[PDB]
Structure 1
């Protein structure tokens, strides 16, 4: 189970006589064969935040139906002000995407893809958008099943 650490930030909370500082971590876990999830963790110190983020990531996971090592069809997704576009690519292309998308795609097992961010590039929002796009991607078998047809009829 591959685990990637997307971002770590230091945050502050004001109290009387000073500020309380903490750390937040965003992590993405995956199996490289169509299962992936992400999570966040907050703690007074970095390792505990990373562990909590990993625990949340393992709790929040989905299954993604890949077409080989690439996507089934072009995907448009958004979460808040972050919009993402993803496109299938031929073998040998690689993962042409930003780091936040790249972690999710590699953990899900995508090897060739072309991706783009529009709008805000906040790491958590971009991860949410990519996660939604991968979750909502469909496949020819599901399309044929829902239309009451055969995959050869669907083409």
Structure 2
């Protein structure tokens, strides 16, 4: 289409009007333009080509194959910065990717909390604020293969809220011990269980429990007695919220099997007074508690 100078003079710069006038006197109005399917001269988008893009066009003053300035008339005298910054926002961050501005600030507890919430539905706040994690076993194991000995890091950890909820988790990693502990912490939260506690301080009576080769003899204790037990059992009691306990381990004292045996004993070897009362149809009275009641 041929347009009058008035219309074209309200959209295009004066410097380009003469070229438009000459083209409208050389190309007849009845020209039937054909599309080339061999050579693509024009870009894949529409452009009047009246403005120089700061990125998609050659930089004015920069030397290049098609620079029209004389070699003594270039205007780039500083070379410490990139001449043509990326267009638009200034980045090419893929959709769904985040710029790693800060590195090394993640909290392993928050990383465990986010993953478990997405995989199991547990509350992230409880994991990151209410739970305490304590490593119990940290060693290196090895497998003999045709290529050679392959070492692995093994971590056994216990987590708990100090208010009845405790869990045991194990983790393995061929790379580093930190990865093994992360997996163990992840596993421990998934294995969280509630353990009965008498007066939220001790166990109900005494426990004689056999876990594989470990013989566990645990006795309930008076208030203010403290924890007088194997060091492995001590850590578990701290996480679980047991304050008073006495005990002795016979036969095997393998740390791993003491920890698992203890967790099993606290759940499978205890019976609350309420459960005993209901099962037998009898009333069970704590004499010490009644003595100080109204």
Deviation at 1:89, TM superposition (A): 1.1
User: Which structure shows the bigger proportion of residues in strand conformation?
Assistant: 1
Q: Give distance in 2, aligned partners of 1:28 and 1:95.
A: 17
1:103 is aligned to 2:244: no
TM-score by length of structure 1 reads 0.92
Distance 1:55 1:125 in 2: 20
Match of 1:139 in 2: 272
Q: Larger C-alpha radius of gyration, 1 or 2?
A: 2
**In the alignment, which residue of structure 2 is the partner of 1:87?**
219
Q: How far off is 1:108 after superposition? A: 1.0
| Coordinate RMSD, CA, aligned | 1.2
The equivalent of 1:25 in structure 2 is: 155
TM-score (norm 2): 0.50
User: For 1:7-46, what per-residue CA distance to the aligned partner results, in whole angstroms no more than 9, with x for missing partners?
Assistant: 1010111223421111000000111111111011000210
**Greater relative contact order (Cα < 8 A, sep 6+):** 1
Q: Which runs of 5+ in 2 are unaligned?
A: 1-130, 286-294
- Aligned residue number for residue 119 of structure 1: 251
Matched, 1:43 2:173: yes
CA distance in 1 between partners of 2:222 and 2:284 (Å): 22
- Counterpart pick for 1:3 among 97, 108, 133: 133
Question: Across the two proteins, how many residue pairs are aligned to each other?
Answer: 152
Report the counterpart of residue 190 of structure 2 in structure 1: 59
Matched, 1:14 2:147: no
